Amino acid sequence: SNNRYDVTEWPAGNPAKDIGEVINSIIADIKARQGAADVDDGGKPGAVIYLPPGDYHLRTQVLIDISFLRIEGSGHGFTSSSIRFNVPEEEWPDLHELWPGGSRVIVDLPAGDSAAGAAFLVAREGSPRISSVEFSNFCIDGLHFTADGSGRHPENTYANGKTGIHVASANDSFRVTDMGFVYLENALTIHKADALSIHHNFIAECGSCIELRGWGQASKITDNLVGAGPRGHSIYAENHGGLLVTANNVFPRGASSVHFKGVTRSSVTNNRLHAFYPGMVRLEENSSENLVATNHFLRDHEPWTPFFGVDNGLDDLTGLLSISGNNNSVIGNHFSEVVDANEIRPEGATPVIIRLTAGTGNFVSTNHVVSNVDTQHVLVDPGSARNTILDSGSDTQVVADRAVNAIRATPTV
Template sequence: MATTVYDVTTWTGATVSPYTDIGLVINQIIADIKSQQNSQTTRPGAVIYIPPGHYTLQTTANIDIGFLTIKGSGHGFMSEAIRDDVNHSAWVETLPGSSHVQIANNNQVGFLVNRATDPGTNGRLNSIVFQDFCIDGVSSTKPYIPGNGKIGIKSQYDTDSLRIEGMGFVYLNTALTIRNADAFNITNNFIAECGSSIQLTDSSIVGKITNNYLISAWAGNSIFIENNEDCVISGNSLLWGARIQMKNVHRAVITGNKFVSNFSGMIVHETPCHEQLISGNHFRRKYGDGGPARNDDLFGMVHLNGNDNSVTANHFAFEVPAANIVPSGATPTVVLVKGGARNFLATNKLASNVAVRHVLDASSTATKVLWSGTAAQLQDLSGGNMSFVATP
């Protein structure tokens, strides 16, 4: 095996077993990498391999070098909430599998990306990869916030081309917390039974969140993203408390996602967000477990705020018994244009078991609504500062 490839179970430099504290073993491996790669032109990085097995993480693994891949042999997800809700005495297996890392301590970060230097002076951390293993918070209760306070991966230092792919996350307060990441790629992960799935703060430019299962409870977010330009959110399945919450996010492309939520507010502009394309998604609002809800049914399945956003060719399905609509007797809102100018709704399909409508709030101007509902399915509070072509 090359000297730049480490197996946590066979590396001879560890002072503890990886089954007892895989975090400490990874930190010792990283120290070994740094001792061997010690100049600007001799730092190709390394691979740390986690074979299938059950590993306890007592010590936070601190990643402070670039070009490092930490990989296992499968995301190993298993629903621990289903296990804990039923008699599982006859189950064949009762723990997640494959390369399974269990965070031992409450309020602990499993994997921390951070370096005690200044990124402006010393550069960013480049090309870090987390791939194909499971991070498990071991035990928790709904809605998992604050829960056990555990975070799967926290990227605190500025990064470029961070990749998180093929991972499993379960029973965590938050699966991923990422700050100042350029060109991030979060793809093909299975994140479930966590308070929040993905949180991107000060998240800079571009990046992709694609092809993930994001199954979060009602108290957190499937995706929270702020201060971002030009991200792509596509091909994801967002379930249960499905919610993308955004602050100061511009020119995002949100396409081809499946939203199934027991609550309103599946896409939310918390502050003005401009020039987004929200297209080709399927939104389903249904009645189910959980709550209290953060927002009532007047808040909108999509809560739009900003200028020049396009909401096109989406399918909206509303399936809530009339007796369970909040406030009682209200007409639920599908798209609420809360504010902003020149927003564009076109060729959206509505299907519902009760009367629903789009709402243009008083602070919205020059909104165009084309073939997205009948005259009865639009409430204009803008004083006529809009254009409307009803669905024939």
């Protein structure tokens, strides 16, 4: 009636047993009360669904097909289930707690069609685009990872077929803020996103964290703490224009930190990025006219012994930043590269920092590499030409055909 709901004060269902059913029942009530689209200049204002702190099992997928639905909690509730599951089991009764908390949605769905494994599915076809759905300040917990045939401990596979929030349909002005996501194969997957804001979340110990799929425009991913798994994405986007990725602190152990396919006229600037593997920032498949500026890159070795010898399958010639596209701008970045000579792959290679594999007119200027071994600060493959490379390394450190690229060596000594 006033469009405000509390999942613990809804007469149908029990949010401890199946919060999915409770929230779907609330959505049915909202639709039943908000049937008319144009009464007194309104009629479908949406609603807010509140999750007090608590442990809520979700056994039924929530389907969101209305605009202006806010689902909110009172705690992102993150704790490192990765650490706990790797603590010897005999010690567990002495730990102060074992599980995540906050306003906690435990995803008890089977694997899927990865969409069928999503705790929250936002889907609606026809017009207009579903708009201004808000997810705020709650926890989504996939609980366990499971055996995947790799022979790794089940809890270290980053595999369970669960998604936190999956948006399947064209959307406008969505927000995901202050969330906690933990132990999900995919935290947050949003297709066809316009003017989306993913802001100030904690998205960690998920196989993949943020994936923007299909296409999108004018969106932003800001002020997030992000940590993925070795076969997955930390931040991924495809066929986006005008995307802004800034003020994120991305820590291990994603396959990459930022991965673009067909992303144009976007900006990946002023992020702190830390990886245990090469291929931290990948601009692929005609990723063009992007600004990659004033980021702090750190690549070093996994120190945590349960994941020692786990990697993303990419060798040190890959580059920390790899670009396949035209007319990008790579300006003012810092690269710390820490590798041991005896584990450089392939054997005896000179690791590369910035690699230009294809495209023309890439402008690379004023980048500082600090490395414990010799590196190729910039490697321009013969398939990329007419690039401009300034103050990003000495002549030895910039491997490039001087006949078809403009190179200025950083002054030395």
